[PDB]
Amino acid sequence: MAHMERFQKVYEEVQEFLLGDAEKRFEMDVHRKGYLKSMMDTTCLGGKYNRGLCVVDVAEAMAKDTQMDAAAMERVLHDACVCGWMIEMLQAHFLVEDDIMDHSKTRRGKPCWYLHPGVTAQVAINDGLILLAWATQMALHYFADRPFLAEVLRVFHDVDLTTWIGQLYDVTSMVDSAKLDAKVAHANTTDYVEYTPFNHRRIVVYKTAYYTYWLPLVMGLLVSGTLEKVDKKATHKVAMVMGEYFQVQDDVMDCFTPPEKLGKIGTDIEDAKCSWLAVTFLTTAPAEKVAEFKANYGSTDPAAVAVIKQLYTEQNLLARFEEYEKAVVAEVEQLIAALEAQNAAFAASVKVLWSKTYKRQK
Amino acid sequence: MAHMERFQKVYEEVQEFLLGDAEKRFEMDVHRKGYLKSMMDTTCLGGKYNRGLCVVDVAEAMAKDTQMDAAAMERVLHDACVCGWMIEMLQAHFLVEDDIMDHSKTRRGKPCWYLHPGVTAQVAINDGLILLAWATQMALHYFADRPFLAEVLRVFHDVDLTTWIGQLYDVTSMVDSAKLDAKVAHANTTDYVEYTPFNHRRIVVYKTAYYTYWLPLVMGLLVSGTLEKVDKKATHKVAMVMGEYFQVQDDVMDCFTPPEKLGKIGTDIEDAKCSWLAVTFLTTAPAEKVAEFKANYGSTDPAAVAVIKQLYTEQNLLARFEEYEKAVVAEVEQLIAALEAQNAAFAASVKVLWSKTYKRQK
Ligand SMILES: CCCCc1ccc[n+](CC(P(=O)(O)O)P(=O)(O)O)c1
Numbered sequence: 034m035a036h037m038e039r040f041q042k043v044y045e046e047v048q049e050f051l052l053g054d055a056e057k058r059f060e061m062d063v064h065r066k067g068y069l070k071s072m073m074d075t076t077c078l079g080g081k082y083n084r085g086l087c088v089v090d091v092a093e094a095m096a097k098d099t100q101m102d103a104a105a106m107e108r109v110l111h112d113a114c115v116c117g118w119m120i121e122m123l124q125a126h127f128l129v130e131d132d133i134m135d136h137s138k139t140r141r142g143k144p145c146w147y148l149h150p151g152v153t154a155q156v157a158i159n160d161g162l163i164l165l166a167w168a169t170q171m172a173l174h175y176f177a178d179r180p181f182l183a184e185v186l187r188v189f190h191d192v193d194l195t196t197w198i199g200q201l202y203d204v205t206s207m208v209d210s211a212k213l214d215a216k217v218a219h220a221n222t223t224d225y226v227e228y229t230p231f232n233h234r235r236i237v238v239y240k241t242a243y244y245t246y247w248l249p250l251v252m253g254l255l256v257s258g259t260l261e262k263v264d265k266k267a268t269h270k271v272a273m274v275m276g277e278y279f280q281v282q283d284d285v286m287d288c289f290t291p292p293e294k295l296g297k298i299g300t301d302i303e304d305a306k307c308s309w310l311a312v313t314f315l316t317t318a319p320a321e322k323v324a325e326f327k328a329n330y331g332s333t334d335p336a337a338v339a340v341i342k343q344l345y346t347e348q349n350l351l352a353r354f355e356e357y358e359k360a361v362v363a364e365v366e367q368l369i370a371a372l373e374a375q376n377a378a379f380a381a382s383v384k385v386l387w388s389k390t391y392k393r394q395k
Numbered sequence: 396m397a398h399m400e401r402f403q404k405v406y407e408e409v410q411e412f413l414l415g416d417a418e419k420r421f422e423m424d425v426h427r428k429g430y431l432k433s434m435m436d437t438t439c440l441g442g443k444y445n446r447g448l449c450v451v452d453v454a455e456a457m458a459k460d461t462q463m464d465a466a467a468m469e470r471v472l473h474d475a476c477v478c479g480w481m482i483e484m485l486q487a488h489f490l491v492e493d494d495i496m497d498h499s500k501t502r503r504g505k506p507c508w509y510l511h512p513g514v515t516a517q518v519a520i521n522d523g524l525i526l527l528a529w530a531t532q533m534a535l536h537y538f539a540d541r542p543f544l545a546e547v548l549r550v551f552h553d554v555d556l557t558t559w560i561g562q563l564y565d566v567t568s569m570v571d572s573a574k575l576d577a578k579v580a581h582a583n584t585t586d587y588v589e590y591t592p593f594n595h596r597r598i599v600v601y602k603t604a605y606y607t608y609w610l611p612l613v614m615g616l617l618v619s620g621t622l623e624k625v626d627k628k629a630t631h632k633v634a635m636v637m638g639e640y641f642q643v644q645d646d647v648m649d650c651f652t653p654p655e656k657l658g659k660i661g662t663d664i665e666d667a668k669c670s671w672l673a674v675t676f677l678t679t680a681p682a683e684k685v686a687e688f689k690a691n692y693g694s695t696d697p698a699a700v701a702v703i704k705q706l707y708t709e710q711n712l713l714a715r716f717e718e719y720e721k722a723v724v725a726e727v728e729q730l731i732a733a734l735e736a737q738n739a740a741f742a743a744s745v746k747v748l749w750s751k752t753y754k755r756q757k
Pocket residue numbers: 126127128130131135196197200240241283297299
């Protein structure tokens with residue numbers, strides 16, 4: 034990737050600043066610094082870097098479009114790499130906490146952070162919070178004399194909130210919303226009434242699309258000072274369309290992609306999740322198959338999990354995804370053409386992002 | 396309390412805004428809105444409001460000294476109340492997460508948030524993140540046109556990181572630090588070599604003093620436009636001294652104050668915590684008493700815990716606390732006296748915060 038080399042160099046720079054800053058400010062000892070170095074390395078690395086690299090892709094596109102000289106371009110790209118590492122650290126925080134919440138086994142081909150024996154969910158909750166804090170630390174340090182600092186913090190913290198609200202919708206999706214009460218313990222759904230297209234879209238837009246698609250594009254525009262050059266409404270719309278699709282892919286892959294290729298072991302079936310597969314099944318399958326699904330979903334019994342996957346296969350859900358994917362492309366292309374008519378440089382950076390997304394395998 | 400009625404009015408205002416903003420931005424449903432409302436109420440209310448009220452106390456004191464008109468004064472005090480609710484919501488976030496981490500039973504005389512039957516630790520972790528997010532949402536909304544927005548965000552997010560690092564020290568305090576390894580589990584200490592005055596002070600300054608003392612003072616100065624008018628080094632010093640003392644009180648109370656008065660059930664003894672009592676016992680007690688301590692500390696057996704309390708009693712730990720407190724009083728009065736020479740209005744606000752702290756019973 035055009036910016037991978039720079040991006041990794043900035044990771045080591047940022048890691049040195051953050052660890053050294055903790056030493057200076059908090060009387061950090063060598064052992065806990067070493068712990069935090071390895072924590073950062075394990076939680077922030079080993080992914081695709083789609084979000085972080087997007088920021089740099091956009092910023093370079095926009096920096097070229099506005100003809101910045103050598104010194105201005107060097108700054109924009111370094112600032113873009115820092116913003117990209119903010120998002121990757123936000124992501125690290127999201128997955129550390131999510132892996133605890135989902136009680137998962139593997140992340141990026143390694144044990145989940147909390148499942149490292151010298152960590153535990155207790156310490157991992159804390160570690161995830163330090164990761165979130167470091168993201169803001171980077172902006173506060175590197176962007177201290179940038180007029181865009183305020184705008185960066187504003188969009189970052191809006192998206193952070195958006196994501197946890199999406200997580201709220203996700204964790205409570207197998208509970209009949211009317212039964213949702215802090216004071217009263219309640220069973221998980223047996224009727225699946227709220228497993229609707231609307232409810233799935235609500236979950237995936239807020240939990241995924243804002244931080245995976247909207248945030249990187251906006252940060253890229255912010256650090257290059259070109260946010261005013263683009264149609265903000267069209268940008269938001271293509272970010273929502275692509276992000277929803279990205280999460281639909283993730284949902285499909287939970288069931289149909291071997292965990293070793295994916296790097297993680299999804300338990301959407303065991304955990305009765307309102308996934309794209311479950312919702313599309315429940316709204317398109319015949320009555321008896323809907324009934325058999327309800328008797329088998331949300332169970333840790335391998336035999337029950339096998340029935341769900343056979344039911345999904347029978348209902349041709351992979352073919353239904355292919356047709357959904359076809360519609361997404363038509364919609365993405367139209368939105369990108371609208372963007373291109375206004376700023377071809379930005380539209381091209383949206384094409385890069387879409388290219389990394391469309392028909393991805395992990 | 397002079398500002399309690401205004402402070403509680405601003406709570407309802409902020410709560411309506413945050414819940415309504417969720418509806419407007421995240422397609423929030425009535426049942427989850429109702430969940431979040433009771434979540435906010437259970438986690439943000441019931442405490443002493445020392446932190447929140449301090450902001451308003453400081454801001455009024457400083458605003459009286461500048462002689463503004465009535466419209467300006469009203470804005471200062473409202474902004475102060477919002478800033479105070481930022482800290483109360485930060486506090487709320489800290490305790491939700493800490494109660495999960497400590498696996499605790501009660502908070503402010505009610506069950507811990509995660510122990511509410513219709514909640515669970517899984518959902519609670521995410522409720523805690525929402526609370527954290529909302530604190531920044533308040534600044535981004537109410538201080539959108541204010542000069543101090545950037546500095547507010549800076550100090551708040553700096554303190555958030557400091558508290559999480561302090562928490563890291565706390566949760567790793569009972570493991571020998573050389574053995575701290577993500578890949579390898581290690582037992583709690585048997586020797587307690589790292590149960591030192593230095594290590595206890597490091598924990599409490601960073602987990603407590605910054606967010607409980609330093610942050611309220613600085614936010615009060617920021618909203619009233621007066622940070623430049625005070626000695627920053629001297630303010631920081633007295634905040635560190637008062638805050639360390641405050642946590643020593645909390646530690647003393649963990650062992651000696653009935654859980655029914657405190658509103659919470661401490662497990663510092665069963666969890667082998669590096670409390671002020673442990674450190675002070677270990678450094679001052681005769682060797683045969685040290686040995687009996689090591690034979691009993693960090694055990695859930697109720698009789699072992701009672702052995703520890705008896706050991707603390709026979710070593711006169713309460714008398715040792717009363718003498719530490721005397722030195723703290725001497726030191727705080729000196730620091731306040733020097734503050735008064737420089738800014739009498741600000742020094743008086745520090746005396747209010749101190750009077751609420753000194754010899755408190757819960
Ligand atoms: C703690 C905030 C969680 C944010 C978030 C948003 C989207 C996807 N994830 C993780 C994925 P996965 O665990 O990567 O498969 P999900 O559990 O299927 O949703 C986490």
